[PDB]
Enzyme design. Structure first.
Site, PDB file in Angstrom:
ATOM      1  N   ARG A   1      12.835   1.339  -7.263  1.00 26.23           N
ATOM      2  CA  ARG A   1      12.973   2.263  -6.145  1.00 26.23           C
ATOM      3  C   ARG A   1      14.482   1.756  -5.620  1.00 26.23           C
ATOM      4  O   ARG A   1      14.631   0.365  -4.984  1.00 26.23           O
ATOM      5  CB  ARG A   1      11.920   1.780  -5.159  1.00 26.23           C
TER       6      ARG A   1
ATOM      7  N   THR B   1     -16.301   5.395   2.946  1.00 28.45           N
ATOM      8  CA  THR B   1     -17.384   5.235   4.126  1.00 28.45           C
ATOM      9  C   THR B   1     -18.032   6.335   4.300  1.00 28.45           C
ATOM     10  O   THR B   1     -19.202   6.275   5.042  1.00 28.45           O
ATOM     11  CB  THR B   1     -16.473   5.066   5.408  1.00 28.45           C
TER      12      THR B   1
END
Lengths: 331, 329, 331, 330
Positions: A240, A14
């Protein structure tokens, strides 16, 4: 004497956007045109800088390793002509890009700072103004020869970062390592040990997309589901698991993992916890490599890096547990 | 006196010393508690300890074990004023999240807790956590499945084990604790979970084929296609920031095809806290998981898939705040 | 049209110049520098007028006469501006903010006191941040109280104290949350507004007053306390133990009782960093008034305010325990 | 044989009982309770002996004579025990810990000052936790300094201050990290040990001393400051702005200069919650910088120095020197 010169690659994000009726939109050259009218960026204490705006800008949530490659090629092409580099990036995958670049660049002798902002430079109270000014100043005055990520007034080791928040505000964290530098009233370089490095000229390694699975273990997860995660074309799987690296002991689940490693798949174990290391034993006997305290981002990009080079499976498995770029804490 | 029922499922809290480190020993926790005077004081509730056989290492647990715990609570519900579930820390948050969905119209406290140090050791957090859980279940009753650790009582389906290396710690990233147990116990102003007004309803739960995966730059449609092959009934995606993901046609097509087959695909964030806010994924049939934890989302899917519910109802229910697990729009 | 803010530049590092000897006050410097900073002249920012004091004051040299001068300045320009910003040195900034809160009654416009540890002119200055935010907040998020802005937080003035100065400056509001936070997005907090009447602004005078501020310690002798209460003392602030406990020996309590008989107002505060004193009956039986959770700054300036109005001793004692401007949490 | 710890129950809520009137002191109640608590008699715990003061001391009513009595108690039993625990009321615990740090010289065994907000008799008591840990730390993680244990932290005694009391008690060591943390696993931190001598233990006497402790504020009158410095005052502690700044009007500075000229020791401390004073005007008026010392350490250090037979120049020099780890040298 002659000021330092920093190369700024505006890859996306941005920062250079402009106000329109439809809202904020990307406007080619807007970032450059604005900086030309802001005296703070042209002070004696500030370095000279050159902006290379990507055409078109990259939407970070749509980036691929081909884009990481393009950014590294840009750095390589301009390396000998500048004293440092600032990579402006959208926040969503900034940590992935920073992590990938840390592995792709070997024997880095100049700072490469990845940063971005939640608010465009044009807005009155902009973090974009703060982050770009600080990134330029730090790259020139407090150089650290690593790929770093600057956000929330802290300079983190790139391959130790993760985007920790996005809803309402953006925030990054380095869960297993303190920042390398703090940018408050007075800039302070912390005593965090520097990353390992060789003593030769810069080497830029290539990187390509790689078929990797990243999954989370949960109570009762079936061997049938895990078998699916390991089907062709998968070359590696990141698991994980619980706490220090524990998982269910059922034989079917463990045999799927062993068979995968037998056919050359690199299986790595990370913790499901927010911080801390994996301390490997049942998974270990099935061919699973411990990923210590590496972030998901570091593990995923490290695998992309190693798989993209001319390396055999056992060398890749050994390398995954070695601290190659400061991404993990050795035992 | 108040009376509390303790389901001792296993975990470090009840272990004992040996030549090869801490080991599970049947009857050890009961014996030790009988010898600790502070647990039998006038200020404490009467309590019953039900030791499970076999004692479970929480990393070995499955939804069948969640079902066994729920059946235990159901059978003794009317005879006690509250419940304490002693558990191993590794998957404690999954069990607490599962029970929150399985129990509907809960009218008594159910506190899940454990410790990193066995109760029998000097300076054990086990002694502190059990004493507080019993006292809180009896005196500061909060009619929800909660998790007690680090002197805080959290809403069970809002928790996750945040650390384990060197020390254990739990977090409730998207909701404050329901109560704090410092010098003076303080119930917090955290709004209570939604509930009905009827009698307790206990729902069954069975293991379900669910995929939980993380999105990363360039992730292949081929790899995602594998994630969605039979027997998978649902897929949890952990995407970037507020729920963004790649927009390439092949990737979105695989997700669309999965939803066409009846697979429930839910979007969560990779961030440590915050909500997912649902556009490209929405068009491919992906449902937003708001700010739910992975544990809450995984157990919620197990719960819904284990009932006699159609795919459309499951999809709608996943985005609704059923037990306080998510923050509505 | 645009909002207009009056800036009283009383002194302080914020407007100084860097020199070989250190930071020095230079007449007209702050105004010269602000005319060269485009961000202060944007459409989103209010118009502002700077009144540079002559001479510029080092806050450690200030007296109640200076508080009076600032209040007179606010009063003289009150009807012509939409808000006020008081630039001040950090050392006694909390005293001035506290004093102004009592002197101004029925305030209907914001008065924000601020300053910085780095001159506004320097690169990366907190001075530039604090002035820009104070102007913007006074104009757009008006809170009709005397506030203090520092470390990106707007505190109720009479609740603040300078908490640190060695190496870095920091302010705290130990017993009340901020009224507003100025991060990426400015956020007004739910902290209840200070009490106020519904009439016209009233500006009360203030003059230096003979007040003692002392700390109780084990064995403190009656002879030493007697000295603290000798004329011209009109009031004494005691900093006692925990919730307000002190020695119970007869000689000590007698000296305090004789002081209240002489018309001296004795107020009790805690030595703790936060919390309330709860009056235990030995001090209250000797005529001591509890200062609840008031900061030393609020208690000292509140006494100056009340003694400067020539009120009866009984009225002053009663007022000290009343929440007049948000400086105290009532029972 | 186990290590043996001497516990002086000087005062505080720890041994109090329950009545229809609140917490009340009951002679021998602490000892009677501890004999019925198995955790205090485990193999891992040291043997201990309790000396309950008769009467107990109300910490808010204590004086330097009480510090002397506690020091004499430690001295009298020093060779017979391996460590010491001083149970004290919280209001002035930090003053006592600070005073003892100066009175004891060449300390070669732990002296831990502690207490509790809640009596040991109550179900959920910090008293049980603090005494169990103090005993265990004194025996197993000995640190040869006068320390203060509270909020699961072992602080250097002369660096502490009671930070909160309303609703809950809390202590802080604003300018120095703890020496030890007593969390799940006891951890001794790398905080550098306090300076010490080599001989055997030296116990210094201490007596009440006329000292003023005051806070500087805008416009503070020379008349008022003059009163603060009237006889019998021997020393004055000033709490000034930020890094040690004060008004520079001549009347104010003149009163301080005159006081110093007649032998009054004037010490400058900051009004800030943490940090050092760096000192200008005050320095030229004879004022001594107290660096980052707490009010507690400065007040007790002055009591210590004034209670010995020392010339005033020696007292002034000593005040700015790090004698027992109470201040951070420049």
């Amino acid at each position: 004497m002659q000021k330092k010169s920093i190369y700024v690659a505006y890859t996306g994000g941005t920062i250079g956007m402009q106000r329109s009726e439809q809202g904020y939109i990307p406007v080619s050259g807007h970032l450059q045109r604005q900086l030309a009218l802001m005296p703070e960026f042209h002070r004696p204490e500030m370095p000279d800088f050159t902006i290379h705006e990507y055409t078109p800008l990259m939407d970070s949530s749509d980036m691929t390793p081909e884009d990481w490659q393009h950014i590294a090629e840009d750095i390589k092409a301009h390396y000998d002509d500048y004293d440092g580099f600032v990579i402006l990036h959208g926040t969503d995958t900034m940590a992935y890009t920073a992590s990938a670049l840390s592995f792709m660049l070997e024997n880095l002798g100049k700072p490469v700072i990845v940063t971005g902002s939640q608010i465009p430079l044009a807005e009155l109270r902009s973090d974009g103004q703060i982050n770009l000014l600080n990134a330029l100043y730090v790259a020139a005055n407090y150089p650290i020869n690593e790929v770093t990520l600057f956000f929330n007034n802290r300079l983190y080791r790139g391959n130790r970062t993760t985007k920790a928040h996005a809803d309402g505000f953006d925030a990054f964290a380095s869960p297993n390592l303190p920042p390398l530098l703090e940018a408050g009233i007075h800039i302070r370089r912390l005593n965090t040990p520097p990353a390992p490095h060789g003593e030769g000229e810069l080497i830029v390694h290539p990187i390509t997309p790689q078929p990797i699975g990243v999954v989370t273990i949960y109570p009762g997860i079936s061997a049938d589901v895990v078998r699916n995660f390991l089907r062709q074309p998968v070359k590696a799987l990141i698991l994980r698991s619980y706490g220090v690296g524990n998982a269910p002991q059922n034989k079917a689940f463990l045999q799927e993992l062993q068979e995968a490693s037998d056919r050359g798949i690199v299986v790595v174990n990370l913790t499901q916890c927010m911080s801390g290391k994996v301390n490997m034993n049942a998974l270990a006997h099935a061919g699973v490599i411990g990923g210590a305290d590496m972030t998901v981002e570091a593990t995923l990009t490290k695998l992309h890096y190693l798989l993209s080079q001319e390396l055999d499976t056992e060398t890749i498995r050994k390398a995954m547990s070695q601290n190659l770029r400061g991404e993990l804490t050795p035992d």
